[PDB]
Amino acid sequence: YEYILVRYGEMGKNRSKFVSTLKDNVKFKLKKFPNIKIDATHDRMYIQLNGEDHEAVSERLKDVFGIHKFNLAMKVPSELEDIKKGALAAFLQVKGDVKTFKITVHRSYKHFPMRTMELLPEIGGHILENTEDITVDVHNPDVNVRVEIRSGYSYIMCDERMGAGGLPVGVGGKVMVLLSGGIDSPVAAYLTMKRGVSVEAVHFHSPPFTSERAKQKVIDLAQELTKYCKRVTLHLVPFTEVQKTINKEIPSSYSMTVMRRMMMRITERIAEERNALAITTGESLGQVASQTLDSMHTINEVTNYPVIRPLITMDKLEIIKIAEEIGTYDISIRPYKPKREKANRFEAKYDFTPLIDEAVANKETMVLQTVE
Amino acid sequence: YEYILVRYGEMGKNRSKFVSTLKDNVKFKLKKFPNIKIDATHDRMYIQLNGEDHEAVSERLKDVFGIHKFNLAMKVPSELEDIKKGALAAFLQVKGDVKTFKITVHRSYKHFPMRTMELLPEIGGHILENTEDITVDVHNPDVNVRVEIRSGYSYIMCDERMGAGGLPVGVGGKVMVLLSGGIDSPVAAYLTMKRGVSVEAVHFHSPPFTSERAKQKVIDLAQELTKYCKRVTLHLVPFTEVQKTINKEIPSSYSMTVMRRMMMRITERIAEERNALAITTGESLGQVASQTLDSMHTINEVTNYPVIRPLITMDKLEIIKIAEEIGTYDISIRPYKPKREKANRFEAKYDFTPLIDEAVANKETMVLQTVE
Ligand SMILES: Nc1ncnc2c1ncn2[C@@H]1O[C@H](COP(=O)(O)O)[C@@H](O)[C@H]1O
Ligand SMILES: Nc1ncnc2c1ncn2[C@@H]1O[C@H](COP(=O)(O)O)[C@@H](O)[C@H]1O
Structure with missing residues (x-):
């Protein structure tokens, strides 16, 4: 709802030429969504939505060569509470027969105060007490709620879409x-x-x-x-x-x-x-x-x-x-x-x-x- | 059991060059089965088995480029009785969970005394009174028994295998x-x-x-x-x-x-x-x-x-x-x-x-x- 995170296909100076080509092609494809800001690092491309319809952006993103996969993400400040919030928001953005879920935590910010062990029940509990007929499955989950914890800001996502693949034109x-x-x-x-x-x-x-x-x-x-x-x-x-x-x-x-x-x-x-x-x-x-x-x-x-x-x-x-x-x-x-x-x-x-x-x-x- | 009928991929002088190339390649592949005779017309290749293990021949046939599909066939003389016989023999050569069947008749010999309408119940009846726990299905048949009626000799088959496709090397x-x-x-x-x-x-x-x-x-x-x-x-x-x-x-x-x-x-x-x-x-x-x-x-x-x-x-x-x-x-x-x-x-x-x-x-x- 707040971001689209694009993961690159596969690739020094070779990455620069790849990233900036993908940037220009994506930019051109989404130019009728003028509110969006795009930052493309050597490992990830971040599309800041700024209110722009994520579905509409998604439908045009999937046709761009050079994108392996992408995710509709929430960027929230990085304490437990703002993380709990973002998880729920991300979860609720999932249309379809939603009945079960799971939480997965990648902890790239090593100095984060809490341990993954502890974060799991917390985020799960918050989604549990804020939904109706919904439980957790570790084996067969409908919605996977993935939490990437970084310093300052953290990303939550549940909606992984395939891209066109290949290489940036x-x-x-x-x-x-x-x-x-x-x-x-x-x-x-x-x-x-x-x-x-x-x-x-x-x-x-x-x-x-x-x-x-x-x-x-x-x-x-x-x-x-x-x-x-x-x-x-x-x-x-x-x-x-x-x-x-x-x-x-x-x-x-x-x-x-x-x-x-x-x-x-x-x-x-x-x-x-x-x-x-x-x-x-x-x-x-x-x-x-x-x-x-x-x-x-x-x-x-x-x-x-x-x-x-x-x-x-x-x-x-x-x-x-x-x-x-x-x-x-x-x-x-x-x-x-x-x-x-x-x-x-x-x-x-x-x-x-x-x-x-x-x-x-x-x-x-x-x-x-x-x-x- | 008596024949393998190979159907060609896709192709005048172009067919000759195709057929004879396929003939030579198949011949070479099956040369350790020296009893076999091969006739290749412009529409079909007939492999006369002459006792040679059809399964063993099949396992080598499937790797030859230029073959779309092939069938293990019975070549029987062309009156009702010899047709009834061949149908049963072909049917019985089918390993696997065999419980139901169907009969299909292509009548290329136009002057054949009986009509397809009449041939159906006859061939079915003969297989019925010569098997145990087996019935007919017109909609969901386990074994399709296909009868090709030609002058002099007729082919029956139940066992259609895919070939390697492509073009004769x-x-x-x-x-x-x-x-x-x-x-x-x-x-x-x-x-x-x-x-x-x-x-x-x-x-x-x-x-x-x-x-x-x-x-x-x-x-x-x-x-x-x-x-x-x-x-x-x-x-x-x-x-x-x-x-x-x-x-x-x-x-x-x-x-x-x-x-x-x-x-x-x-x-x-x-x-x-x-x-x-x-x-x-x-x-x-x-x-x-x-x-x-x-x-x-x-x-x-x-x-x-x-x-x-x-x-x-x-x-x-x-x-x-x-x-x-x-x-x-x-x-x-x-x-x-x-x-x-x-x-x-x-x-x-x-x-x-x-x-x-x-x-x-x-x-x-x-x-x-x-x-x-
Ligand atoms: N030592 C070699 N002998 C024959 N062909 C080669 C040899 N090295 C490379 N090739 C051919 O050149 C193609 C591309 O080379 P390369 O980009 O170095 O993998 C390979 O797919 C081979 O067909
Ligand atoms: N009028 C044309 N203009 C441009 N390219 C053509 C034209 N005709 C054929 N070609 C190219 O040549 C290829 C093979 O030609 P053909 O074997 O005649 O189909 C086609 O796939 C096209 O790429």
Whole structure:
């Protein structure tokens, strides 16, 4: 009711970069709760509520990567009486079938006048004589009342919620994610972010002979991903001229291979511009619509940038499960052996460099946020 | 008791390559059951048992990638009487608390004299008057007795077992997997195989100042992986001289970066020799012992071969879970920001090409099998 105490996932200078990234991301997520103050130490993040609805704050906190668990806590002055009080207040904030309880005491303030042995019956007694049909269970308690005793101030909590886990978005760096309208790529973007890497999305569209409705899918997908980070930058690359030239200059059996090669070349040029160190795709091995190893081998020739492939060894079912969980599935669902020698030999016949450079120069950038 | 009918995972020329790969892998797995005959059509694989212990065959069948499910079946001639018989025999082969049953009839042979409507009470009646304390349930049956009626011969089955899933090892091609003694790399090798890609393992060891016990770990890990494919080819590359030269020629802050770059260069040279189209690693993002994106970005400079990274966005817990499931965990457990400009500038100072070529020439190859 007074505080939310967030416990970090897992991590010197590495912790600083972790904490301050988490701070900024949490701050941004809760900015529509302007009364809150946040102190983030190297071991714990303290969210001072100052009247702000703890439930409302909780519902937004659970979507932030980098948080293992968090607790709704009471911060009370550190003598027995103020401790007794805070325990009760914390206890009463627990909705649901509440019939039994337990008290647990961590004593970090070693010079506290009373012993844990003695504190137990005291706090229990105070909750007992201030409730109605409620007893204690040491073995099967409904509500665990945990008392952390520190000097000056002490925390009481009963309400432990799971966080999203993973790593604060931004701590690991930045990659470009190749986003398309299928089920896969948004999932891959999501998994990248969960490991603390922020993503900028890159989408190739060919405005005449691809529809606006298909472009809206990608925008909608990028919009949905805003739930998991501060903002999603979406680069829309006009691909139509490159697509046309490939049809004219390249033998048909290789047109798709070269187009994907051209996609990767352009994406690398964007990655450099944006100081991104890798490129994410939703490629996976061995599905009907998934490319062969031969295809992958031939397309990857054009870049020695890491190509992060989160779904590389995942099956359709686990991919769909996640897409459903994160809520990109129903948007995605809207219904709209190559060799290196030959790929090179065909590309030798026309200089795609001006096309590549213009496509980079012509990209449009949207910046999406969760619109509260 | 007479047959095992395997149902395929999921997949023209693509099915042929799938079926015959599965056939060869199953054949190899069951070669110590020499009486068995295997017919594999494009829709089903039939294993004629010919007296061979079906349980023993089942226990080895469940570890073969490419099998969704399989059934212990009876193949009986296709008139009512031989059908009644086979149903009972199939039913009686079911160990466990058997008290109720049900009959289900798929009628693929359209010109079969009797209708499903009539077949139901007949087969049920025959099992009823030939068992003791057993009735039928249409809603909550212990044993489902499924009758597939075809011309000439018909199948009865009650015993549906799950298979390993994934894709027949070999169907997708071949990659080199970089294998080390940690928890990760064997898991990555395993996940690669489950998507139907066979792996050849590559391990760098530096015989004087790495132990034989550490090399035995990798051998043990490769041995354990033989459970999931026909054989594991393990390449042991002597790395000591390259390691020494790096210590002498390279500034210390970059020695590890260059060593890994040298590893990747050698591995690519081996991949080519072995007609492998990619390289698998157990790299993941954002664990304490995992490399940074900067590190990954700088090491990947030296190869434009696909680098398959199955665990790239997995956490420690899911990695450990799998390593435990596949039984590599307890072997692994045995206790034994770089920039491209600087990496290149330092490597410019000494020609590592002769070292790279000799290491490739000096690799030793072991071939491991599951030793029944
Ligand atoms: N039009 C596109 N724009 C951006 N990325 C794409 C596009 N098409 C495909 N991709 C990326 O390439 C991956 C594999 O392509 P595919 O095998 O054609 O589904 C997808 O998961 C996307 O990450
Ligand atoms: N000595 C080695 N031999 C072969 N592969 C290795 C070796 N050391 C590391 N690797 C590979 O590189 C990956 C990441 O290395 P690391 O970040 O050092 O654990 C491991 O998962 C292995 O696939």
